[PDB]
């Protein structure tokens, strides 16, 4: 069980860290979402789908910089709704297939009344997302720690 991004960075067997850029919608009012699909941008896929189930689910997700401040949040993990950040483990995906296919992770974020300007800064970390991978087969435990960086900056009107 490996994973990549759209650009071609890999984290392999066993686990590892990576960052992920991308771009945002560069203006969001207060009362709208801004979307941060990462379905689009994180595949992974199991290593041996012959004789190996792979459980994956989003162990945590954290907010950081302008989103944090800035952003009240919900993830979507395979179609259902959580608080992001989050406050518990999601229930676990299969992957049962050797053909790279998108993590469903999705990130609602709508501006807090207070938040006004430059809400998120190009560059920036807006959070950290940790898929956690398990097996039907052996004791494997792994982290996959995705880094994400905002391409742009993101304003608030007001």
């Known amino acids: ?3 990549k991004t ?3 960075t890999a984290i392999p067997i066993g ?3 990576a960052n992920v850029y991308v771009n945002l919608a560069p203006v969001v009012n207060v009362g709208q979402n801004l979307v941060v699909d990462l379905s689009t941008q994180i595949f992974c896929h199991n290593d041996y789908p ?3 189930t792979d459980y994956v689910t989003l162990q945590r997700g954290s907010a950081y910089g302008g989103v944090l401040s800035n952003f009240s949040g ?3 993990y395979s179609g259902s709704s959580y608080p992001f950040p989050t ?3 999601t229930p676990r995906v ?3 297939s050797r053909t790279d296919k998108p993590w469903p992770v999705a990130l609602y974020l709508t501006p807090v009344s207070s938040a006004g300007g430059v809400a998120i800064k190009a560059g920036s970390l807006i959070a950290v997302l940790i898929l956690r991978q398990t097996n039907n087969y052996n004791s494997d435990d792994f982290q ?3 880094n994400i960086y905002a391409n742009n900056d993101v304003v608030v009107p007001t």
Do not use: D, L, Q
Request: net charge negative; aromatic share 16%.
């Open 6 to 8: 759209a650009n071609g």
């Open 87 to 89: 406050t518990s483990e």
């Open 144 to 146: 996959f720690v995705w």
């Open 1 to 3: 069980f490996a994973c």
């Open 50 to 52: 012959e004789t190996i």
């Open 15 to 17: 686990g590892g860290s």
């Open 94 to 96: 299969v992957y049962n």
């Open 74 to 76: 919900t993830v979507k």
